Amino acid sequence: SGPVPSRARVYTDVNTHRPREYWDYESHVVEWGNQDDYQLVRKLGRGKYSEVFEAINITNNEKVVVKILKPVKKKKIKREIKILENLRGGPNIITLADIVKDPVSRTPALVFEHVNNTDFKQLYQTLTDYDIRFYMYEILKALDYCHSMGIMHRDVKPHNVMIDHEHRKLRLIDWGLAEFYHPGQEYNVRVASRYFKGPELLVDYQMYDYSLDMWSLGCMLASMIFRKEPFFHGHDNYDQLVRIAKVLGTEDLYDYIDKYNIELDPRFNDILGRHSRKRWERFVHSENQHLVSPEALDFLDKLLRYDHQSRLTAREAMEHPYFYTVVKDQARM
Ligand SMILES: Brc1ccc2nn[nH]c2c1Br
Ligand SMILES: Brc1ccc2nn[nH]c2c1Br
Ligand code: NA
């Protein structure tokens, strides 16, 4: 007997109610620009896989960011373009400005409106309590928007959050793993970086939704308020679930397994063992106590649930008491 089917609790049918062309990215017709409008200035430090550059638009002298889409399926390129076009102008969403190909190389590139190469990872272990709440709220605006637009990001992590801390501006970047949510669709579980992978990915439950992003956000929040990077520090994808099980406990894990009739990979049998659900107080110490409050712990607890259906939505998260002072100060200013 197969796994039990699942639906998103929110924004379940938004793509069904759209015209086919909104989400049918394989049939999207891209008018490919010319690279000659742009001059690359310097390579942005994004590690070994990346080809991201600061560039100049020659015509207007405006600074842009260029991402060279190194060889991968045509299908993945049209998916990222269509998602960026659909989300263009959304709150805290990076703005796609142009789509170009090398005249000779024929390699496709995305041009984005300029942001400083200063990610949340470089800032997010040195912020005040108020600033963690502020930036988390800004990330939730981007996630509620993309979820409301029928899209899951699937790669929420500090490296994909660009922050201009002087202007208190944030952008959610790298939509290369993002997908359209369709009720009943079984998705690839080989998404997200190890430390941010939701339990659904680790146990191979394919009928996941927007709630995957809310697990990743919880992992980010835990690492920031406890100053523990990453929070769930697995050796590999198998040990990753063990690190979660040692915190969330094994009772709720096996109840989740039972509820969705998930066939657990046999490897897990020897390694998961039996663990109590730990009180969050265990992670609190003298160097992180100024970031931890009852409000923060209540909010974190409601994000980090095995059962994806149980997790706060982005909109429910934005209504949590943890953000009351952020919401007040936003209206006031
Ligand atoms: Br936009 C762009 C994209 C790729 C490029 N490679 N050489 N110069 C390039 C420019 Br300008
Ligand atoms: Br900055 C920036 C802006 C948009 C991006 N999309 N993928 N990677 C990106 C980077 Br790095
Ligand atoms: Na405290």
Residue numbers in the entry: 2 to 334
What does the paper say about this structure?
CK2 is a constitutively active pleiotropic serine/threonine protein kinase that belongs to the CMGC group of eukaryotic protein kinases (EPKs). Here, we present a set of crystal structures of eight halogenated benzotriazoles in complex with a catalytic subunit of human protein kinase CK2.
The canonical binding mode is observed for 4-BrBt, 5-BrBt, 4,5-Br2Bt, 4,6-Br2Bt, 5,6-Br2Bt, and 4,5,6-Br3Bt. For 4,5-Br2Bt, one of the binding modes is similar to the canonical one, and the second one is 180° rotated, so that the positions of the 5-bromo substituent and the N8 nitrogen are roughly preserved but the ligand is flipped. The canonical binding pose of bromobenzotriazoles in the hCK2α-binding pocket orients the triazole toward the active site lysine (K68) and the phenyl ring toward the hinge region. In the cases where this is possible (for compounds with the 4-bromo substituent), the halogen bond may instead be formed with one of the conformers of R47 or N118. The arginine is anchored in the P-loop region that in these cases adopts at least two distinct conformations; the asparagine belongs to the hinge region. In contrast, 5-, 4,5-, 4,6-, and 4,5,7-bromobenzotriazoles bind hCK2α with substantially lower affinities, and 4,7- and 4-bromobenzotriazoles virtually do not bind to the enzyme.
